[PDB]
Amino acid sequence: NQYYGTGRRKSSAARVFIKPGNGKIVINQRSLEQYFGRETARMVVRQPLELVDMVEKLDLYITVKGGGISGQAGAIRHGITRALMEYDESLRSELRKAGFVTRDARQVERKKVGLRKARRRPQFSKR
């Protein structure tokens, strides 16, 4: 039966679907490789799939919008570990031990009045 886990990260929002089958990954009807897997941090989406067995065990249908390049990549990694609900008490002990289900909020701070961007005070001069 097809399972689901959402995941979101820093103004991005993934929705991870998952089926038992071959080890392919479809993201927004692109390949995992040609969407950003040819780019840096290609395997933060494969980080939960390294620690518990991926090899050719289950495929991953993904669509994701919002955020940026590394913003969507963190949204998938949080979406897979919530999609990993099949073996939850066999998975989410050591999967929690490596992190991976902490949503890790840390939004951008709003720009403050008087400040140049949210911390940067403009150039104090004594005299």
């Binding site: 780019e39 840096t40 941090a41 290609r42 395997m43 933060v44 992190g99």
Partner: protein, 151 residues
């Protein structure tokens, strides 16, 4: 800080091969938040290092790191009005993070063609310890061993 004794951040390891150590070496070399352009320096400086050494991937970088790695460093502890340089042993966390910084200072100077070629020549000149980054380390050890009378 004043009140805190707080810890440090769990950095993410290197993607291409497992190394949390040179995942820090990317971030030291990284300027202006461009990490992807900093990594393509780091990899292309390693295979040209692996070309002329033969040591495979990070065992070449490990030899060149321990020859710039310092043991004793000086910091000015003021005692009763006076102000003089006091040698102290570097903590083992700082010990190689200070070593990875001095390569990047030696590799941003000595401008030949490109940063991947620049940083590969400083890793090579540190392996047989004749470069700028080992010139930095010896002078730090020159600050100790003459001013080692204070401890």
């Amino acid at each position: 800080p004043r009140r805190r004794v707080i810890g440090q951040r769990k950095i993410l390891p290197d993607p291409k091969f497992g190394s949390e150590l040179l995942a820090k070496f990317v971030n030291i070399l990284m300027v202006d938040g461009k990490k992807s352009t900093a990594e393509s320096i780091v990899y292309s400086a390693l295979e040209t290092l692996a070309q002329r050494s033969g040591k495979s991937e990070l065992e070449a970088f490990e030899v060149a790191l321990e020859n710039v790695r310092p043991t004793v460093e000086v910091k000015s502890r003021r005692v009763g009005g006076s102000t003089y340089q006091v040698p102290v042993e570097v903590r083992p966390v700082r010990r190689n993070a200070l070593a990875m910084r001095w390569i990047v200072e030696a590799a941003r100077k000595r401008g030949d063609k490109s940063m991947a070629l620049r940083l590969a020549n400083e890793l090579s000149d540190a392996a047989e310890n004749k470069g700028t980054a080992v010139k930095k380390r010896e002078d730090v050890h020159r600050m100790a061993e003459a001013n080692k009378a204070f401890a």
